[PDB]
Design a protein around this nucleic acid. Structure first.
Ligand SMILES: [Mg+2]
Ligand SMILES: [Zn+2]
Ligand SMILES: [Zn+2]
Ligand SMILES: [Zn+2]
Lengths: 171, 93, 168, 519, 58, 107, 88, 229, 84
RNA sequence: GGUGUCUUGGGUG
């Protein structure tokens, strides 16, 4: 889910950069640094509200090094999953041991044991996909799936869902 | 650079020179503290870029501090006498 | 590096088991406190954005920053390009394509209408605006907490929601 | 910059919060339980795990790494273990306060003898300082000899009604005389009994006496698990090229471990009650003298050679202890010392520096587009000729020693690099004579390089230093950065100290021949 | 004076040290709020933006 | 004000504070023989009003605990009937500046 | 092994009288065996890092217990210069 | 509020002497022909006599001087001592002004009385030990510089300026500006470790040292004793 | 919250000795790290003397933040404090 | 590439 997040980022600037176009250079550095990153404490930082209008304030010179420190405060948007939250998706991969579904920026994997037993896999169909008497899961399908697990890995996180519960699955 | 030398540098108001005498011309060290519990019990693996305070089960709010090695030794001796010195990097009240 | 208003969280002698997340039980983590703060320290209600509000906010920010970049002079698959960096473009592209494949409110007007209509806990508030549900049953089972509050209104809210849902 | 990169943010210490360590947190921050006394495995390479030299505690060797953090000897801070005690014992530095709390509280139900009903105590509570509040509560609560069950119709305060003991101190043994109702049955109060009594004190009661709920619980003044410091705190030394003796703390911990195991050999089999006390008291004494070997009215924990053990308190106190001997003042690099001489031909703010000292000391000078030719000429000159240079520091911290580098001609200096050139003319240096009775005993001088091994001073500055030329020696300190150079030259320089604030008159004058001669 | 006893009293009462003094900042190896360290030096932007436009970060 | 001759017994002394809202002070006659505010070393004390104490605290951005202090048992505080929190202003001779105003708060 | 030069020792690990010696130079070579090739540690005695001079008299005998004993006397000359102390 | 290196012993001239000597040094009279300004020192000598809109200002000046006399004699220095360490030397400023503007030949001075009086008044209202428009700030500021204003008014009196120092307008303006600037330079800087400096200034003299005196008496004083020798 | 508006700044308008010393040191260290120099460098190559030249011409782009004992502070640019 | 710890006595400033 998307959360509106006030967040900051302390930075260090070399004296060589101490020019007349400083604030815009720090704005570009901030925009490069934060637009796309994941953090286990926040979720996923897709964009930043009012990117060009971040305030760098007044930086402080660190005694002994000569580099300036800035507390560039701004309000951004973050996307975080939670166990027990329902998230829609579209399947990406298929395999006998389960399938992958792309959710937002991420990819959600559902295990074989967590699938209605009327669903039967087919490696030979065009397109290859799960089928069922009155149920279908092919590439491009919609899946209203609940999250029952989210691992926090620092660089990339992965979520394994479960469509075994009522009111969930194909819609 | 004893205590009376420190008094003379304080009278002169030369704070940077005093800090440089006592740190970069002497036993300067680097330690990691837990931002939550404030003990120097943070296990740091710099080549693997991984940190942990196992008491607080913390891995994200950890800071490094440059302090005299004698100060680190003092805090470890205090911990050895069951005294907990907690180094906090921000004021509350 | 990445920090926020959450500061000390200093060590009381006791710990707390209630730190793991379970979104069925209104446990999100010690970053989404029931009363958030802003960059001026003032208190502020938590924010839980549905996909519609989020899509509008991101589109607005991107087009504003694009107009800023151009000196003063339409599709998510194009609108995500406004960022800087390949990783930025990729992540915003995936987010925008997900948003534009499930945005039942495909305008600011109906999103504003649902904002007016809804205003109550923002968690279920946003999950109702994000998850279409036929009757009371789906809501009270996907969100099991609407039972023990005795202020439901799911019937008419869902009716008016699916009524305002544009065709496709 | 001489620290390898870490990803954590750099911050400064703003607050220090003292307090006791709970057994829970002692176990939590620890990394290995210590129980086996014997240092080595069987005198075999890489000693017995679970001993006092477990490699989990950290590395003190140059070619071995810490099994806990994986860092070299230079970087590993050391890691704490824990060592559970068989019986709880008093902390030696808290016996008086344990005795005070014992007098204040009800020794059966853990409740204050008097309540907020009495307005005198109701106002003694109203002190903000924990220590003043504790004193104001002890000066009242110490005389009531019962836990009255009724609050001052019958209104009950929840009390019990058990009589109070007369607490007493004999060494490390807290005696408490219960005067029942005649014969006052006097019993010994063990650390475990006091611990049990202390765990029952309620949080608000605890707050009233002046303790803290999160940082200082009164039962943490009784030791039940003991932290084991890393070997850094108790490093070994070498006696004749192959021999090492452990530090005093290590042998003390070994003695404590022997005492602990002997305790664990009594509550596991027959123990007719006159050996348990003896061995538990041995444990108490070892733990006490591990922390404080200056206890009044008892012998001192002694070493093999007859000297007393260097306890931690003795490590911390005195002119030579940690605070005054290693933190308020310490030995410093980049300094020099030699006999001083007088030179009528020097300027007031000049000091003559011997060539050998000018070459031994150094200043690190960042290479810039205004000094690259001069610095490369110094690099060519080498570390044995003046003006030369001693080291070249690359943009990542790698030192290039110019002695052993045989190919000194094949170095091109990059920008942002650093050359550690020799001491040269007009460099500002701090000059100092002990004792430093006033701020004008340490003054900043401009350098002039001269032959001979003696310092040179203009003779008019010998009055503020109180110096003469019949044996005196003075110290020279070299600032290692541009900020400290500027501080010296703009605050401590000799011309700036001519007038003193002590008596708003000059302190430097015309002295000796220059005077007689001008007359 | 009385270093160990004072530290014990600080432990037994959970004293909070505000680190505003001189000696405390000395023993921790930090810049004392004294003399040259009694203020802060920021980086000025209003004066900086007067520089020639070719002196800019690239 | 209760001026006595020889002594005031502690049991009597205990009634002084429990008689609110009135205030009872006592002095001994031997103490009152000389007026100490006439001594050359005792400068003139002037109690501030509540508004003026607030003005003093805001001008210096001060809290009460950061002021110089005077004991409630001080002979000149005893002579002036100072209560806790009241601020005197003490103008006194200054050999470097002529005149100097000091402020003390009553313990 | 020490950072000084060992090229001045005779076959007995001792320098001979009459040889100029500078600071950090080894004047008595000694080895300490490594407890359980390359099974020895050194225990060599360098000259003091400050002093120059010329070896005068290398004595060699045995102690009370019959183990080898060595005394090496250096010699030098000090000529008065600036900073030397004199009194009447 | 002054830095302890910046002050020098100076005589306060309104304090000493008898009232007749004070009167002859300081009192001017316009109506009285003989006791007025000596005619041979000013260009405008003849225009001065008999005026009233100026004798009022002269009387105000003289009354301020008498107020200073009474204040210093009755409150600050009751025993008559008049040589005290004060900020900004006056003698050296006046002689430097004489040297710079070449004040010889006792030339007719073009420096009018009202300009002198208003110049000294403005100078006396420009010596800032504390800055702020608050009212306790003003009170503390005036108490801070009362003695120095007394000095500046004892020296820069109308009769003294015109007769004893014979300054013209340029030298006068220079004296005022120099007093301004050197007083602003005599102030202590924030950040001074005045406690360490004071401790050293008291302790260092102790290294060179039936009433008890010297080191035992200083020890009694600092270790506050309930009984003394 | 703790910043003081440019109108009610009641501290001294003069650069103190400690402020001057630290400002010169910081500027010299900055210039020695190949920072741009605002003055015209004619003869001198020492970063400290260049910093002194910049200080005299009121061309040092730094700010002094003067903390009061109550925690608040005032901001003064180097070009507006008066140098003797 | 790595040159150990504490006391006693005699001096220099
Ligand atoms: Mg001498
Ligand atoms: Zn922690
Ligand atoms: Zn380690
Ligand atoms: Zn009881």
């Amino acid at each position: 889910m998307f959360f509106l997040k006030d967040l900051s980022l302390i930075l260090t600037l070399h004296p060589s950069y101490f020019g007349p176009q400083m604030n815009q250079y720090l704005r570009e550095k901030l925009l490069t640094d934060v637009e796309g990153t994941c953090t286990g404490q926040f979720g996923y930082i897709v964009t930043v509200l009012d990117g060009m209008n971040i305030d760098v304030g007044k930086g402080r010179i660190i005694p002994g090094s000569g580099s300036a420190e800035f507390e560039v405060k701004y309000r951004a948007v973050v996307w975080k999953p939670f166990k027990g939250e329902v998230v829609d998706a579209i399947v990406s991969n298929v395999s006998p041991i389960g399938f992958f579904a792309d959710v937002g920026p991420l990819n959600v994997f559902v295990s074989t044991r967590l699938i209605p037993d009327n669903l039967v896999y087919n490696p030979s169909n065009s397109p290859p996909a799960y089928m069922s008497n009155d149920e279908l899961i092919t590439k491009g399908s919609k899946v209203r799936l609940k999250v029952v697990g989210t691992r926090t890995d620092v660089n990339e996180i992965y979520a394994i869902g479960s469509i075994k519960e009522d009111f969930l699955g194909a819609i | 650079f004893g205590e009376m030398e420190r008094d003379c540098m304080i009278a002169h108001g030369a704070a940077g020179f005093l800090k440089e005498r006592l740190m970069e011309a002497s036993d300067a060290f680097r330690v990691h503290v837990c931002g939550i519990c404030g003990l120097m019990s943070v296990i740091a693996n710099l080549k693997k870029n991984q940190f942990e305070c196992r008491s607080c089960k913390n891995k994200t709010n950890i800071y490094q501090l440059h302090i005299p090695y004698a100060a680190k030794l003092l805090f470890q001796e205090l911990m050895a006498m069951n005294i907990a010195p907690r180094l906090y990097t921000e004021r509350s009240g | 590096v990445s920090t926020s208003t959450v500061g000390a969280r200093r060590r009381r002698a006791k710990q707390q088991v209630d730190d793991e997340e379970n979104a069925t039980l209104l446990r999100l983590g010690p970053e989404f406190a029931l009363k958030q703060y802003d960059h001026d320290g003032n208190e502020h209600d938590l924010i839980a954005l549905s996909l519609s509000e989020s899509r509008l906010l991101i589109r607005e920010a991107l087009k504003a920053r694009s107009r800023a970049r151009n000196g003063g002079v339409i599709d998510d698959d194009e609108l995500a390009k406004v960022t800087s960096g390949a990783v930025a473009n990729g992540v915003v592209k995936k987010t925008l394509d997900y948003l534009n494949t499930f945005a039942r409110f495909k305008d600011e007007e109906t999103c504003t209408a649902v904002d007016q209509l809804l205003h109550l806990h923002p968690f279920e508030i946003a999950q109702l605006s994000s998850l279409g549900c036929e009757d009371v049953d789906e809501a009270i089972t996907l969100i099991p907490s609407l039972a023990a509050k005795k202020e439901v209104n799911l019937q008419r809210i869902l009716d008016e929601l699916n009524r305002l849902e544009d065709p496709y | 910059s001489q620290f390898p990169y870490s990803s954590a943010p750099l911050r400064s210490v703003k607050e220090v919060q003292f307090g006791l360590l709970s057994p829970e947190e002692i176990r939590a921050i620890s990394v290995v339980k210590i129980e086996y006394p014997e240092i080595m495995d069987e005198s075999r390479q890489r000693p017995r795990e679970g001993g006092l030299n477990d490699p989990k505690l950290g590395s003190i060797d140059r070619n071995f790494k810490c099994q806990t953090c994986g860092e070299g000897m230079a970087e590993c801070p050391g890691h704490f273990g824990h060592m559970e005690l068989a019986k709880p014992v008093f902390h030696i530095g808290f016996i008086p306060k344990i005795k005070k709390v014992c007098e204040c509280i009800c020794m059966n139900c853990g409740k204050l003898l008097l309540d907020e009903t009495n307005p005198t105590m109701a106002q003694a509570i109203r002190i903000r300082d924990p220590k003043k509040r504790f004193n104001a509560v002890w000066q009242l609560c110490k005389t009531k000899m019962v836990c009255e069950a009724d609050a001052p119709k019958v209104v009950s305060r929840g009390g019990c009604g058990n009589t109070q003991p007369v607490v007493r101190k004999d060494g490390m043994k807290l005696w408490g005389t219960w005067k029942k109702s005649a014969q006052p049955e006097r019993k010994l109060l063990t650390p475990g009994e006091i611990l049990n009594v202390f765990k029952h004190i309620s949080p608000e009661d605890c707050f009233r006496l002046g303790f803290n709920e999160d940082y200082a619980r009164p039962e943490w003044m009784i030791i039940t698990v003991l932290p084991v410091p890393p070997p850094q705190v108790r490093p070994s030394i070498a006696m004749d090229e192959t021999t090492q003796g452990q530090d005093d703390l290590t042998h003390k911990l070994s003695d404590i471990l022997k005492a602990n195991i002997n305790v664990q050999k009594l509550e596991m089999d027959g123990s007719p009650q006159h050996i348990i006390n003896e061995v538990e008291q041995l444990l108490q004494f070892h733990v006490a003298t591990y922390m404080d070997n200056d206890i009044a009215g008892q012998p001192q924990a002694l070493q093999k050679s007859g000297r007393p053990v260097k306890a931690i308190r003795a490590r911390l106190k005195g002119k030579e202890g940690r605070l005054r001997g290693n933190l308020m003042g310490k030995r410093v690099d980049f300094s020099a010392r030699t006999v001083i001489s007088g030179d009528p031909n020097l300027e007031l703010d000049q000091v003559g520096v011997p060539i050998s000292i000018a070459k031994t000391l150094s200043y690190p000078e960042t290479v810039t587009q205004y000094n690259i030719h001069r610095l490369t000429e110094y690099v060519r000159n080498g570390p044995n000729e003046h003006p030369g240079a001693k080291y070249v520091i690359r943009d990542n911290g790698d030192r290039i020693d110019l002695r052993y580098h045989k190919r000194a001609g094949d170095i091109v200096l990059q920008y942002g690099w650093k050359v550690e050139r020799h001491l040269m003319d007009d460099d500002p240096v701090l000059f100092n004579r002990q004792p430093s009775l006033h701020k004008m005993s340490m003054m900043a001088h401009r350098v002039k390089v001269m032959p001979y091994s003696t310092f040179r001073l203009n003779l008019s500055v010998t009055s503020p230093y109180n110096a003469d030329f019949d044996g005196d020696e003075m110290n020279l300190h070299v600032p290692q950065s541009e900020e400290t150079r500027a501080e010296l030259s703009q605050l401590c320089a000799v011309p700036l100290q001519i007038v003193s604030p002590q008596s708003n008159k000059p302190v430097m004058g015309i002295v000796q021949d220059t005077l007689c001669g001008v007359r | 004076e009385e270093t160990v006893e004072i530290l014990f009293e600080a432990g037994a009462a959970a004293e909070l040290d505000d680190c505003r003094g001189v000696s405390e900042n000395v023993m921790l190896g930090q810049l004392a709020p004294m003399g040259t360290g009694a203020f802060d030096v920021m980086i000025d932007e209003k004066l900086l933006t007067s520089l020639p436009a070719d002196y800019a970060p690239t | 004000i209760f001026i006595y001759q020889n002594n005031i017994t502690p049991s009597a002394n205990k009634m002084i504070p429990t008689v609110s809202p009135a205030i009872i002070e006592t002095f001994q006659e031997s103490d009152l023989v000389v007026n100490i505010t006439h001594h050359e070393l005792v400068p003139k004390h002037i109690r501030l009003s509540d508004g003026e104490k607030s003005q003093l605290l805001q001008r210096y951005k001060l809290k009460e605990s950061q002021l110089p202090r005077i004991q409630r048992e001080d002979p000149v505080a005893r002579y002036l009937g100072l209560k806790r929190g009241q601020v005197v202003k003490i103008i006194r001779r200054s050999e470097t500046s002529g005149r100097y105003a000091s402020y003390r708060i009553c313990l | 092994l020490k950072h000084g030069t060992y090229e001045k020792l005779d076959e007995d690990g001792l320098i001979a009288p009459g040889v100029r010696v500078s600071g950090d130079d080894i004047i008595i070579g000694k080895t300490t065996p490594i407890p359980p090739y390359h099974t020895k540690r050194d225990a060599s005695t360098p000259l003091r890092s400050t002093e120059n001079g010329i070896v005068d008299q290398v004595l060699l005998t045995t102690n009370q217990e019959g183990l080898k004993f060595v005394k090496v006397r250096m010699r030098t000359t000090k000529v008065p210069q600036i900073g030397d102390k004199f009194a009447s | 509020g002054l830095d302890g290196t910046q002050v020098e012993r100076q005589t306060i001239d309104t304090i000493p002497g008898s009232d007749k000597a004070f009167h002859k040094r300081y009192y001017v009279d316009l109506m009285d022909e003989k006791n007025s300004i000596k005619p041979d020192v000013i260009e405008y000598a003849a225009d001065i006599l008999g005026d009233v809109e100026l004798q009022k200002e002269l009387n105000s000046e003289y009354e301020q001087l008498v107020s200073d006399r009474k204040f210093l004699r009755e409150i600050v220095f009751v025993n008559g001592d008049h040589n005290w360490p004060l900020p900004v030397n006056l003698r050296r400023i006046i002689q430097n002004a004489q040297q710079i503007f070449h004040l010889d030949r006792a030339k007719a001075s073009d420096l009018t009385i009202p300009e002198i009086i208003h110049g000294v008044r403005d100078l006396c209202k420009k010596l800032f030990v504390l800055r702020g428009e608050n009212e306790l700030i003003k009170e503390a500021q005036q108490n801070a510089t009362s003695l120095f204003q007394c000095l500046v008014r004892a020296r820069l009196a109308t009769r003294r300026i015109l007769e004893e120092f014979r300054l013209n307008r340029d030298a006068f303006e220079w004296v005022l500006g120099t007093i301004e600037a050197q007083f602003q330079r005599s102030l202590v800087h924030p950040g001074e470790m005045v406690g360490v400096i004071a401790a050293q200034s008291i302790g260092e003299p102790a290294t060179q040292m039936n009433v008890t005196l010297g080191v035992p008496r200083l020890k009694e004083i600092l270790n506050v004793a309930k009984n003394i020798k | 919250e703790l910043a003081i508006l440019k109108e009610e700044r009641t501290t001294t308008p003069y650069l103190t000795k400690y402020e001057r010393a630290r400002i010169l040191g910081t500027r010299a260290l900055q210039i020695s790290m190949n920072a741009p120099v605002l003055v015209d460098i004619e003869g001198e190559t020492d970063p400290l003397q260049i910093a002194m030249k910049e200080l005299s011409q009121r061309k040092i782009p730094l700010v002094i933040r003067r903390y009061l004992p109550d925690g608040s502070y005032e901001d003064w640019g180097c070009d507006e404090l008066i140098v003797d």
